[PDB]
């Protein structure tokens, strides 16, 4: 039986409990599969209730134990803490059935990773600035409530109409308070190695995210190149095309010291990052 999942109607017309098919198969029409992996499968679906378009992600295998169930269900809780924000993916409803967790969110466009692969070059700075502003707005929303995304990267930023984008994938989100999972080392803030976790980590990740898409550069997983991006100076070989304004903003975001690194509110207050 399907049960609703929320951390705040735990018990549908298109779904008959007498029928043996699952709630997902009975109340949704799978138009296409947006992605699949160890996390499970993501489908572009049309709801048989209101007809609007949504995206539903389901886990791959049933819950192994209580720890696995609580680990997967924690994403729903983190998504609720974010709340409704124009630059954050909105969660409609979440439910479990047969040890499988389903998350239904609004349908967004392609991820920033897919867009940059298709463009096959450095993104135009006009597109970069808008994506930097929208993600900073999302980060400022999370940071104001004491939340750290910890996985800001092109794959977790989804494009929208008119050059807008939304932040997604809150599985690694933690609430700073008086349980951290491993993140992508290519976008890892330098202080995370020493266990210093704070909202400043997201700003550094977005800095490397923008640096990657604005220069079409592959971020290193480790080594000397990993250090060079974290010593306070930018690599001149790929940052030549960057404008003086964008380069200065990246230097602010890539400050190795968390105490000195600028905040999302401070960056958004700058005139270059104000909505034109
Ligand atoms: C389904 C879902 C649940 C929770 C959550 O936080 C997010 C961001 C989503 N979610 C979307 N709302 C996507 C979209 N296009 O609207 C979307 N596309 C994906 C593509 C790949 Br490949 C892998 C995972 C994806 N997860 C997605």
């Amino acid at each position: 039986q399907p049960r609703r999942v929320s951390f705040r109607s735990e018990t549908s017309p298109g779904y008959d409990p007498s029928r043996p098919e699952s709630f997902f198969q009975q109340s949704f029409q799978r138009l296409s599969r947006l992605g699949h992996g160890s996390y499970g499968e993501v489908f572009k679906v049309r709801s048989k209730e209101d007809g609007r378009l949504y995206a539903v992600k389901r886990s791959m295998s049933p819950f192994r134990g209580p720890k696995d169930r609580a680990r997967k269900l924690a994403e729903v809780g983190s998504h609720e803490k974010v709340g409704q924000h124009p630059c954050c993916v909105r969660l409609e409803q979440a439910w479990e059935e047969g040890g499988i967790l389903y998350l239904q969110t609004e349908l967004c466009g392609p991820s920033l990773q897919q867009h940059c692969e298709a463009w096959g070059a450095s993104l135009p700075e006009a597109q970069v600035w808008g994506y930097l502003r929208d993600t900073l707005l999302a980060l400022a929303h999370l940071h104001s409530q004491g939340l750290v995304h910890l996985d800001v990267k092109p794959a977790n930023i989804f494009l929208g109409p008119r050059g807008r984008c939304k932040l997604g994938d809150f599985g690694l989100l933690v609430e700073l308070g008086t349980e951290v999972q491993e993140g992508d080392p290519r976008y890892m803030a330098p202080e995370l190695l020493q266990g210093s976790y704070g909202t400043a980590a997201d700003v550094f990740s977005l800095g490397l995210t923008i640096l990657e898409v604005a220069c079409n550069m592959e971020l290193p997983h480790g080594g000397e190149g990993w250090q060079q991006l974290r010593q306070g100076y930018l690599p001149p070989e790929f940052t030549a095309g960057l404008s003086s304004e964008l380069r200065s903003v990246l230097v602010m975001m890539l400050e190795p010291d968390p105490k000195l690194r600028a905040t999302a509110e401070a960056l958004l207050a700058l005139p270059v990052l104000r909505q034109p």
Side-chain angles (χ1 to χ4, degrees), residues 1-2 5-7 9-10 12-15 17 20 22-28 30-43 45-47 50-66 68-83 85-132 134-161 163-178 180-217 219-223 225-232 234-258 260-273 276:
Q1 56 183 2
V5 176
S6 182
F7 285 72
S9 301
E10 301 180 7
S12 172
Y15 163 76
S22 71
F23 173 82
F24 180 52
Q25 297 169 175
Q26 289 188 35
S27 183
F28 298 94
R30 287 194 288 274
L31 312 177
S32 66
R33 183 168 69 176
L34 301 180
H36 61 73
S38 60
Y39 58 91
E41 293 176 339
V42 180
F43 298 100
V45 298
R46 183 184 297 277
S47 57
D50 55 0
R52 299 171 60 181
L53 292 179
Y54 295 100
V56 171
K57 173 177 59 181
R58 69 165 179 247
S59 52
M60 177 182 58
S61 57
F63 298 142
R64 310 133 45 188
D68 187 26
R69 178 184 180 273
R71 189 186 314 168
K72 293 178 179 174
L73 265 56
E75 182 177 2
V76 179
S78 295
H79 219 116
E80 294 179 353
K81 300 178 182 179
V82 172
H85 189 271
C87 299
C88 293
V89 178
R90 181 190 60 86
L91 177 68
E92 183 68 27
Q93 66 174 355
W95 67 92
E96 55 179 335
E97 182 179 359
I100 301 297
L101 177 61
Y102 299 83
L103 286 83
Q104 182 181 5
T105 58
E106 60 172 352
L107 186 56
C108 298
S111 76
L112 186 55
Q113 185 185 19
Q114 301 171 8
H115 175 82
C116 290
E117 293 175 1
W119 186 258
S122 303
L123 288 190
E125 282 209 14
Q127 302 188 25
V128 175
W129 283 107
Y131 296 150
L132 177 56
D134 292 350
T135 310
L136 278 179
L137 289 173
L139 287 186
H141 180 63
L142 271 57
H143 297 171
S144 69
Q145 303 185 246
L147 308 174
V148 186
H149 189 271
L150 288 176
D151 200 22
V152 176
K153 54 184 176 185
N156 291 343
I157 299 172
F158 297 86
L159 267 54
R164 307 293 300 278
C165 66
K166 294 170 183 295
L167 185 64
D169 196 357
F170 305 107
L172 277 65
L173 183 141
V174 300
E175 175 165 22
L176 299 181
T178 55
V180 172
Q181 305 182 14
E182 289 280 6
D184 200 324
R186 291 173 286 179
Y187 312 88
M188 172 178 39
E191 66 268 24
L192 296 189
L193 285 182
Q194 284 68 29
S196 173
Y197 282 87
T199 62
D202 285 337
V203 180
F204 191 93
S205 295
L206 181 52
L208 290 181
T209 292
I210 293 304
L211 182 68
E212 163 182 8
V213 302
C215 305
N216 192 235
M217 169 175 44
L219 298 184
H221 293 261
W226 188 93
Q227 304 287 344
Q228 293 174 351
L229 303 186
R230 295 164 175 81
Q231 297 299 330
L234 304 184
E237 67 282 2
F238 290 111
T239 57
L242 295 181
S243 66
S244 301
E245 295 79 9
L246 184 58
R247 185 191 312 268
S248 300
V249 175
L250 290 185
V251 171
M252 302 180 191
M253 302 179 61
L254 296 186
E255 164 64 29
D257 195 329
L260 306 179
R261 185 178 305 122
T263 64
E265 292 289 345
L267 300 164
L268 288 167
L270 297 183
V272 294
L273 281 173

